[PDB]
Amino acid sequence: MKTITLYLDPASLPALNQLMDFTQNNEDKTHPRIFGLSRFKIPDNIITQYQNIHFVELKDNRPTEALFTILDQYPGNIELNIHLNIAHSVQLIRPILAYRFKHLDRVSIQQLNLYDDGSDEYVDLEKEENKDISAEIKQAEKQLSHYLLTGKIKFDNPTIARYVWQSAFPVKYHFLSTDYFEKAEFLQPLKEYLAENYQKMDWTAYQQLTPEQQAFYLTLVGFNDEVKQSLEVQQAKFIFTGTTTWEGNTDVREYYAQQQLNLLNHFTQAEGDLFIGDHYKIYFKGHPRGGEINDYILNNAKNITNIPANISFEVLMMTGLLPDKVGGVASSLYFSLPKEKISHIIFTSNKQVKSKEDALNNPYVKVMRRLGIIDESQVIFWDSLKQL
């Protein structure tokens, strides 16, 4: 038999973990591998080092039929080693289960590894709080069995169905918050069901790589030497989280750039409400869609170091390069930051959020609060901050 490894993710965090798994196994130059990581392009000069390496697109959270063309290149007994995004696991596995079913004499699933997407898994589990979790698990197992045979996806509880894979296959889950599963009382049946099949996400794997593998990983994730050196300074470091625009009663983008500078000043200046201290080196991490607003902020801020907007906080954590303090405009990225590193999170006006009270009711803010990751005093509504 032959093992084929499949790495599938439409998001970022599972992909970063899957690219770490590839890096750890990178001395094996010929192991069959299929990559469907929508947000990551593996460079040509890495790809050409490998044999039996394949790429597939995802559409609507599923690998396309070009997957079958790849698997058909391996005509004997094959076992699939599959890595997936938890939130999207049901859709992502659909075409794989189909291939298995057609070839049940010769295709089998060796195992699954599933990784959190981010806050969504937790925000989704919160919606299940008043349900009978024991009963939801048993029903989902039954519907999964049916799925395996028919390809018919119809789960009564699509959220819980994300967690019943062990009823069919060997599985390992990698969670952002094991505390959530262990401390949310309503999830006790799910915690016990999962048994030894989960662990906390592995943020320190990079540190155990060879220096050569560390460089390889940085190249996979698009994190160049210039950026890396800038983040290794022996000084306290603060990074501001930029945004795009919000409901400011104007369509002038320069206004939103202007206001983000004032928010930054609340952190950097002694008279600011959110003052971090004069000994911090300041960095700016723009929103990936900030475009020219990011250029405006960088040019009009003094003595700030840019971290290219295409670089995620998830990859900063994967690489051990997260600054000492993070603050700025709210985003779901804050959900997975260590509690010690979060300063203040500032919510801007939108259809959903028009006060601090609304901001405290934000879905990921609610989970962070339940987990004690932040106190409510760390959530600020933007219009509370004076012009400095």
Q: Which amino acid is it at 199? A: Q
Using the Cα atoms of residue 60, residue 64, residue 65 and residue 71 in order, give the sign of their dihedral.
Answer: negative
Which region, left, alpha or beta, applies to residue 326 given φ > 0 means left and ψ of -120 to 50 means alpha?
beta
Strands (DSSP E) along the chain, which ranges? Answer: 2-9, 33-37, 53-55, 58-59, 62-63, 78-85, 107-115, 171-175, 198-200, 237-241, 281-285, 305-307, 325-329, 342-347, 379-381
Q: CA–CA separation, 388 vs 385, rounded Å?
A: 9
Long-range contacts of 296-300 (CB under 8 A, 24+ apart): 296/253, 296/254, 296/257, 297/242, 297/257, 297/260, 297/261, 297/264, 300/257, 300/261
Angstrom distance (rounded) from CA 375 to CA 344: 10
- Give ∠ CA 205-201-337 in degrees, rounded to 5: 100
At which residue do the structure tokens 């919160």 appear?
126
DSSP string, 321-374: ---SEEEEE--GGGGGS-GGGEEEEEEPP-SS-SSHHHHHTSHHHHHHHHHTSS
The answer to whether 40 is a known ligand-binding residue is no
* 232 known member of a binding site: no
Q: What distance separates the 2 farthest-apart alpha carbons in the chain? A: 71
Resolution in A: 1.5
Cα angle: 235, vertex 256, 384; to 5 degrees: 75
User: Is the distance from CB of 171 to CB of 141 less than 8 angstroms?
Assistant: no
Q: Is 377 annotated as a binding residue?
A: no
Buried b (16+ CB within 10 A) or exposed e, 305-333: bbbebebbbbbbbbbebbbebbbbbbbbb
Task: Give the domains, in start order, of the chain with CATH numbers.
Answer: 1-209 (3.40.50.11120), 210-385 (3.40.50.11110)
Q: Are 260 and 352 in contact (CB under 8 A)?
A: no
Residue 312 marked ligand-binding: yes
Does residue 277 have a known ligand-binding role?
no
Q: Residue 219: which of 333, 291, 315, 287 has the closest Cα?
A: 315
Q: Does residue 287 have a known ligand-binding role? A: yes
Give the strand pairing for 198-200 and 305-307: unpaired
